[PDB]
From a paper:
CD46, or membrane cofactor protein, is a type-one transmembrane protein from the complement regulatory protein family. When responding to complement activation, CD46 binds the complement activation fragments C3b and C4b, which have been deposited on the host cell. CD46 then facilitates the cleavage and inactivation of these complement activation fragments by acting as a cofactor for serine protease factor 1. Bovine CD46 acts as a cellular receptor for bovine viral diarrhoea virus (BVDV), a bovine pestivirus causing reproductive losses, as well as other clinical signs, such as diarrhoea and mucosal disease in persistently infected animals.
The STP region which is situated between the SCR and the transmembrane domain was not present in these protein constructs. The putative BVDV binding site was located in SCR1 and encompassed two peptides, E66-V69 and G82-L87. When mapped to the structure, these peptides were found on the C and D beta strands and D’D loop and formed a single binding site due to the antiparallel beta strand configuration. The area of interaction with BVDV was identified as two peptides on SCR1, as seen in both bovCD46 structures; these form a single interaction interface. Comparing this region with the same region in the human structure revealed a shift in the DD’ loop. An intriguing feature of these two crystal structures was the crystallographic dimer formation, which was identical in both protein constructs, despite them varying in size, unit cell, and space group. Our attempts to verify that this crystallographic dimer was physiological were not conclusive.
Author numbering:
A (entry chain A), B (entry chain B): 41 to 169
The structure:
């Protein structure tokens, strides 16, 4: 009879398109989601439909990427409102009294190319008034 | 003779309605599309039919707005399937085993007001079974 629905993972997704049923011996190859990277590069991540008609056990193979850390602009400050620079986080820029924020005040950690995250915007500056 | 077809832009559209033909000296003012915002606010964006009957050079002036970042619901997870919270992306909500999803499982980053994007739905929760 075989294996039906593959489990959903935190950090991975099926590499290709899933079919309705799987028979013993067939495998689904997984790959990191957007914004995640391999825990151990080169490691092949796969589920196998087994003879006892179960899905085999697959350890989570990927981890959330991080954007580069960010310095305070001169005469102002960057706030890691989400507690980190992990993918899917944002940062808030503010300026000190007497200064005016020139540029973007919120920046987002996003996928830049297939491999890599980056901040959506450059840092602003704090200009004197 | 004059200038005929103004180029269509990635991030901008003409502010008003276009006429069949333009003469040298006339200008078409551009504005951000729905779901975009100025790259450098204040900067006036316009094409001008020049005297050499060409359209002037206009850099792309706007950039895709972003929706606010999203936290994983307790006992579950939000998946930025498109790699960002940019206008016109979606996120998927999933719950851990033992938990069911109470609410909407897909949220879309949409235009909310003239200036503004927001998610189409509030986050669901994950409740025990
Ligand atoms: C954001 O990511 C979502 C999820 O991956 C994208 O939507 C998905 O788009 C794929 C195509 O890339 C759709 O696949 C299609 O499946 C149908 C049958 O399901 C098939 O007839 C087609 O030939 C095609 O293979 C998929 O259904 C769709 N999934 C969902 C949940 O909407 C979306 O395109 C991405 N958005 C942006 C802005 O990049
Ligand atoms: C289905 O068969 C597989 C064997 O291919 C079982 O996996 C093994 O299970 C034992 C006991 O749980 C472990 O000590 C081994 O390390 C497992 N091997 C592998 C490769 O995973 C699996 O438990 C079986 N499942 C059911 C429901 O019968
Ligand atoms: C990162 O932190 C921001 C700021 O606290 C979170 O965005 C706020 O979320 C609250 C609800 O928790 C909303 O009421 C606000 O509208 C959001 N603020 C802004 C400026 O949009 C965001 O959810 C957090 N992101 C992650 C990934 O945890
Ligand atoms: C047209 O004239 C402008 C100067 O107003 C010049 O910058 C542009 O390169 C010219 N282009 C052509 C095709 O003649
Ligand atoms: Cl810091
Ligand atoms: Cl996240």
């Amino acid at each position: 009879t075989g294996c039906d629905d593959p489990p959903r993972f935190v950090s991975m997704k099926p590499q290709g398109t899933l079919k309705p049923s799987y028979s013993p011996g067939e495998q689904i190859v997984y790959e990191c989601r957007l914004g995640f990277q391999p825990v151990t590069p080169g490691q092949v991540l796969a589920l196998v439909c087994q003879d006892n008609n179960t899905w085999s056990s697959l350890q989570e193979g990927c981890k959330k990427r991080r954007c580069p850390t960010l310095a305070d602009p001169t005469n102002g400050q960057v706030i890691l409102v989400n507690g980190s620079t992990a993918f899917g986080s944002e940062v808030h820029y503010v300026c000190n009294n007497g200064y005016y924020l020139l540029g973007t005040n919120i920046s987002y950690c996003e996928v830049s190319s297939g491999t890599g995250v980056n901040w959506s915007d450059n840092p602003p500056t704090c200009e004197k008034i």
